[PDB]
PDB file of C-alpha atoms and ligand atoms in Angstrom:
ATOM      1  CA  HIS A   3      45.628  59.258 -28.691  1.00  0.00           C
ATOM      2  CA  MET A   4      46.481  57.333 -25.532  1.00  0.00           C
ATOM      3  CA  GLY A   5      45.935  60.547 -23.556  1.00  0.00           C
ATOM      4  CA  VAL A   6      48.751  59.690 -21.157  1.00  0.00           C
ATOM      5  CA  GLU A   7      51.272  61.900 -19.377  1.00  0.00           C
ATOM      6  CA  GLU A   8      54.510  59.904 -19.723  1.00  0.00           C
ATOM      7  CA  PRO A   9      55.918  59.241 -23.219  1.00  0.00           C
ATOM      8  CA  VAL A  10      57.090  55.870 -24.501  1.00  0.00           C
ATOM      9  CA  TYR A  11      60.206  55.692 -26.702  1.00  0.00           C
ATOM     10  CA  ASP A  12      61.150  53.735 -29.832  1.00  0.00           C
ATOM     11  CA  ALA A  13      64.343  51.694 -30.172  1.00  0.00           C
ATOM     12  CA  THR A  14      66.214  54.683 -31.632  1.00  0.00           C
ATOM     13  CA  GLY A  15      65.550  56.617 -28.433  1.00  0.00           C
ATOM     14  CA  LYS A  16      62.897  58.943 -29.857  1.00  0.00           C
ATOM     15  CA  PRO A  17      59.631  59.566 -27.969  1.00  0.00           C
ATOM     16  CA  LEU A  18      56.489  58.547 -29.862  1.00  0.00           C
ATOM     17  CA  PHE A  19      54.864  61.723 -28.518  1.00  0.00           C
ATOM     18  CA  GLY A  20      55.498  64.492 -25.986  1.00  0.00           C
ATOM     19  CA  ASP A  21      58.867  65.917 -24.946  1.00  0.00           C
ATOM     20  CA  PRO A  22      61.918  63.747 -24.239  1.00  0.00           C
ATOM     21  CA  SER A  23      63.271  63.703 -20.686  1.00  0.00           C
ATOM     22  CA  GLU A  24      66.645  62.498 -19.468  1.00  0.00           C
ATOM     23  CA  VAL A  25      67.188  59.490 -17.238  1.00  0.00           C
ATOM     24  CA  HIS A  26      68.600  59.990 -13.741  1.00  0.00           C
ATOM     25  CA  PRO A  27      72.433  59.851 -13.691  1.00  0.00           C
ATOM     26  CA  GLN A  28      72.298  57.104 -11.058  1.00  0.00           C
ATOM     27  CA  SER A  29      69.644  55.013 -12.772  1.00  0.00           C
ATOM     28  CA  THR A  30      70.737  51.541 -13.893  1.00  0.00           C
ATOM     29  CA  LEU A  31      69.434  52.540 -17.331  1.00  0.00           C
ATOM     30  CA  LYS A  32      72.329  54.010 -19.300  1.00  0.00           C
ATOM     31  CA  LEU A  33      71.448  55.894 -22.470  1.00  0.00           C
ATOM     32  CA  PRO A  34      72.151  56.043 -25.303  1.00  0.00           C
ATOM     33  CA  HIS A  35      72.157  52.248 -25.756  1.00  0.00           C
ATOM     34  CA  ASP A  36      71.096  50.008 -28.651  1.00  0.00           C
ATOM     35  CA  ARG A  37      68.157  47.620 -28.331  1.00  0.00           C
ATOM     36  CA  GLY A  38      65.599  45.719 -30.338  1.00  0.00           C
ATOM     37  CA  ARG A  39      67.119  42.720 -32.088  1.00  0.00           C
ATOM     38  CA  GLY A  40      64.183  40.744 -30.706  1.00  0.00           C
ATOM     39  CA  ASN A  41      61.446  40.416 -28.117  1.00  0.00           C
ATOM     40  CA  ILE A  42      62.977  37.917 -25.719  1.00  0.00           C
ATOM     41  CA  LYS A  43      61.196  37.065 -22.470  1.00  0.00           C
ATOM     42  CA  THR A  44      63.046  35.840 -19.425  1.00  0.00           C
ATOM     43  CA  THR A  45      62.434  35.175 -15.714  1.00  0.00           C
ATOM     44  CA  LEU A  46      63.124  37.030 -12.454  1.00  0.00           C
ATOM     45  CA  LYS A  47      65.834  34.573 -11.404  1.00  0.00           C
ATOM     46  CA  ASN A  48      67.620  34.890 -14.752  1.00  0.00           C
ATOM     47  CA  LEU A  49      67.526  38.650 -15.424  1.00  0.00           C
ATOM     48  CA  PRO A  50      70.566  39.751 -17.425  1.00  0.00           C
ATOM     49  CA  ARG A  51      73.444  41.437 -15.624  1.00  0.00           C
ATOM     50  CA  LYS A  52      75.694  44.371 -16.390  1.00  0.00           C
ATOM     51  CA  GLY A  53      77.970  43.411 -19.278  1.00  0.00           C
ATOM     52  CA  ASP A  54      75.665  40.844 -20.869  1.00  0.00           C
ATOM     53  CA  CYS A  55      74.964  42.895 -24.005  1.00  0.00           C
ATOM     54  CA  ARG A  56      78.366  42.035 -25.457  1.00  0.00           C
ATOM     55  CA  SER A  57      77.798  38.278 -25.803  1.00  0.00           C
ATOM     56  CA  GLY A  58      74.065  37.876 -25.257  1.00  0.00           C
ATOM     57  CA  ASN A  59      73.041  34.445 -23.965  1.00  0.00           C
ATOM     58  CA  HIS A  60      71.364  31.159 -24.855  1.00  0.00           C
ATOM     59  CA  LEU A  61      67.998  32.923 -25.349  1.00  0.00           C
ATOM     60  CA  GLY A  62      69.419  35.388 -27.877  1.00  0.00           C
ATOM     61  CA  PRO A  63      70.740  38.963 -27.810  1.00  0.00           C
ATOM     62  CA  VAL A  64      70.599  40.934 -24.554  1.00  0.00           C
ATOM     63  CA  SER A  65      70.119  44.694 -24.261  1.00  0.00           C
ATOM     64  CA  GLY A  66      69.018  44.941 -20.626  1.00  0.00           C
ATOM     65  CA  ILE A  67      66.209  44.360 -18.145  1.00  0.00           C
ATOM     66  CA  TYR A  68      62.632  45.295 -19.129  1.00  0.00           C
ATOM     67  CA  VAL A  69      59.559  44.773 -16.945  1.00  0.00           C
ATOM     68  CA  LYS A  70      55.811  45.337 -17.110  1.00  0.00           C
ATOM     69  CA  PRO A  71      52.955  44.325 -14.822  1.00  0.00           C
ATOM     70  CA  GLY A  72      52.142  40.634 -14.839  1.00  0.00           C
ATOM     71  CA  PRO A  73      54.955  40.506 -14.063  1.00  0.00           C
ATOM     72  CA  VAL A  74      56.590  39.995 -17.463  1.00  0.00           C
ATOM     73  CA  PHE A  75      60.358  40.305 -17.951  1.00  0.00           C
ATOM     74  CA  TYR A  76      62.418  40.735 -21.130  1.00  0.00           C
ATOM     75  CA  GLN A  77      66.153  40.751 -21.875  1.00  0.00           C
ATOM     76  CA  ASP A  78      65.562  42.555 -25.187  1.00  0.00           C
ATOM     77  CA  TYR A  79      62.512  44.321 -26.626  1.00  0.00           C
ATOM     78  CA  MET A  80      61.714  45.866 -30.020  1.00  0.00           C
ATOM     79  CA  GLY A  81      58.599  47.980 -29.433  1.00  0.00           C
ATOM     80  CA  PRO A  82      58.059  51.234 -27.530  1.00  0.00           C
ATOM     81  CA  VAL A  83      59.215  51.323 -23.887  1.00  0.00           C
ATOM     82  CA  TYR A  84      59.196  53.652 -20.887  1.00  0.00           C
ATOM     83  CA  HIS A  85      62.496  55.292 -19.974  1.00  0.00           C
ATOM     84  CA  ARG A  86      60.878  56.495 -16.716  1.00  0.00           C
ATOM     85  CA  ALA A  87      58.318  54.816 -14.458  1.00  0.00           C
ATOM     86  CA  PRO A  88      54.895  56.246 -15.366  1.00  0.00           C
ATOM     87  CA  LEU A  89      53.780  57.321 -11.898  1.00  0.00           C
ATOM     88  CA  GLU A  90      50.294  58.161 -13.252  1.00  0.00           C
ATOM     89  CA  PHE A  91      49.746  54.392 -13.186  1.00  0.00           C
ATOM     90  CA  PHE A  92      51.244  53.758  -9.755  1.00  0.00           C
ATOM     91  CA  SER A  93      49.607  53.956  -6.334  1.00  0.00           C
ATOM     92  CA  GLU A  94      50.586  53.401  -2.694  1.00  0.00           C
ATOM     93  CA  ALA A  95      51.468  49.776  -1.977  1.00  0.00           C
ATOM     94  CA  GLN A  96      50.772  47.846   1.202  1.00  0.00           C
ATOM     95  CA  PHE A  97      53.270  45.547   2.914  1.00  0.00           C
ATOM     96  CA  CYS A  98      55.233  43.002   0.892  1.00  0.00           C
ATOM     97  CA  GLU A  99      56.613  39.934   2.692  1.00  0.00           C
ATOM     98  CA  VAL A 100      59.392  39.106   0.207  1.00  0.00           C
ATOM     99  CA  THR A 101      60.916  41.364  -2.494  1.00  0.00           C
ATOM    100  CA  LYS A 102      63.639  41.146  -5.127  1.00  0.00           C
ATOM    101  CA  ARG A 103      65.366  44.434  -6.013  1.00  0.00           C
ATOM    102  CA  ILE A 104      66.061  44.529  -9.749  1.00  0.00           C
ATOM    103  CA  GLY A 105      67.398  48.006 -10.530  1.00  0.00           C
ATOM    104  CA  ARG A 106      67.117  51.758 -10.098  1.00  0.00           C
ATOM    105  CA  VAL A 107      64.666  53.642 -12.293  1.00  0.00           C
ATOM    106  CA  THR A 108      63.929  57.285 -13.000  1.00  0.00           C
ATOM    107  CA  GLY A 109      60.374  58.219 -12.079  1.00  0.00           C
ATOM    108  CA  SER A 110      58.175  60.396 -14.285  1.00  0.00           C
ATOM    109  CA  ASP A 111      58.767  62.932 -11.502  1.00  0.00           C
ATOM    110  CA  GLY A 112      62.476  62.841 -12.359  1.00  0.00           C
ATOM    111  CA  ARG A 113      63.386  61.237  -9.051  1.00  0.00           C
ATOM    112  CA  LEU A 114      65.422  58.060  -8.481  1.00  0.00           C
ATOM    113  CA  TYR A 115      63.597  54.917  -7.299  1.00  0.00           C
ATOM    114  CA  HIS A 116      64.686  51.426  -6.376  1.00  0.00           C
ATOM    115  CA  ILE A 117      62.462  49.021  -8.324  1.00  0.00           C
ATOM    116  CA  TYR A 118      61.402  45.636  -6.956  1.00  0.00           C
ATOM    117  CA  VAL A 119      59.290  42.593  -7.718  1.00  0.00           C
ATOM    118  CA  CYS A 120      57.072  41.574  -4.803  1.00  0.00           C
ATOM    119  CA  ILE A 121      56.293  37.913  -4.126  1.00  0.00           C
ATOM    120  CA  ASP A 122      52.630  38.781  -4.842  1.00  0.00           C
ATOM    121  CA  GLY A 123      53.605  39.708  -8.416  1.00  0.00           C
ATOM    122  CA  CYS A 124      53.443  43.489  -8.012  1.00  0.00           C
ATOM    123  CA  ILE A 125      56.152  45.776  -9.368  1.00  0.00           C
ATOM    124  CA  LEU A 126      57.181  48.127  -6.539  1.00  0.00           C
ATOM    125  CA  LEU A 127      59.056  51.421  -6.275  1.00  0.00           C
ATOM    126  CA  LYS A 128      60.760  52.971  -3.248  1.00  0.00           C
ATOM    127  CA  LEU A 129      62.540  56.340  -3.262  1.00  0.00           C
ATOM    128  CA  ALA A 130      66.372  56.443  -3.296  1.00  0.00           C
ATOM    129  CA  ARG A 136      56.921  54.923   1.150  1.00  0.00           C
ATOM    130  CA  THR A 137      56.338  52.221  -1.466  1.00  0.00           C
ATOM    131  CA  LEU A 138      54.388  52.450  -4.734  1.00  0.00           C
ATOM    132  CA  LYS A 139      52.993  49.632  -6.883  1.00  0.00           C
ATOM    133  CA  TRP A 140      52.396  49.541 -10.627  1.00  0.00           C
ATOM    134  CA  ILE A 141      48.630  49.076 -10.708  1.00  0.00           C
ATOM    135  CA  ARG A 142      47.747  49.849 -14.331  1.00  0.00           C
ATOM    136  CA  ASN A 143      49.477  48.263 -17.317  1.00  0.00           C
ATOM    137  CA  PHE A 144      47.791  50.919 -19.409  1.00  0.00           C
ATOM    138  CA  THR A 145      49.850  51.088 -22.612  1.00  0.00           C
ATOM    139  CA  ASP A 146      51.218  47.549 -22.273  1.00  0.00           C
ATOM    140  CA  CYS A 147      54.708  48.974 -22.863  1.00  0.00           C
ATOM    141  CA  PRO A 148      57.439  47.732 -20.546  1.00  0.00           C
ATOM    142  CA  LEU A 149      59.791  49.897 -18.460  1.00  0.00           C
ATOM    143  CA  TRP A 150      63.440  49.753 -19.481  1.00  0.00           C
ATOM    144  CA  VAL A 151      65.051  49.163 -16.099  1.00  0.00           C
ATOM    145  CA  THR A 152      68.735  48.543 -16.912  1.00  0.00           C
ATOM    146  CA  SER A 153      71.206  48.743 -19.805  1.00  0.00           C
ATOM    147  CA  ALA A 154      73.185  45.517 -19.861  1.00  0.00           C
TER     148      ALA A 154
HETATM  149 ZN1   ZN B 201      75.413  47.345 -22.987  1.00  0.00          ZN
END
């Protein structure tokens, strides 16, 4: 009843609605992977790195990088998440003075995008033209990376 195109997925990897789709082979998200011991927020500077799921960190368990508009970052998350960027809620972005690249995500079009955080707070995508995440419609984050 959200009436959206792109599904969100539970912590077992099952879509809450619609058909499942696979992640891009070169995305930083590697599935299958466990998640959901807690909802643990973090910051851009301290995003978890590859390998961190083994030991976790001082904030608690780590499953990977999650992001939603705000921007808000998590190192683990329990609720439904996007496995692909929901391009229905993105639009063309204008120039960004300073960016931080945080991963590589599959788009809802099946294509591979670099994902960034702009200094203005916007979440940006670039293929391999820039798009920005303008609508936090479902308030579900995008699972960017498996740690
Ligand atoms: Zn892992």
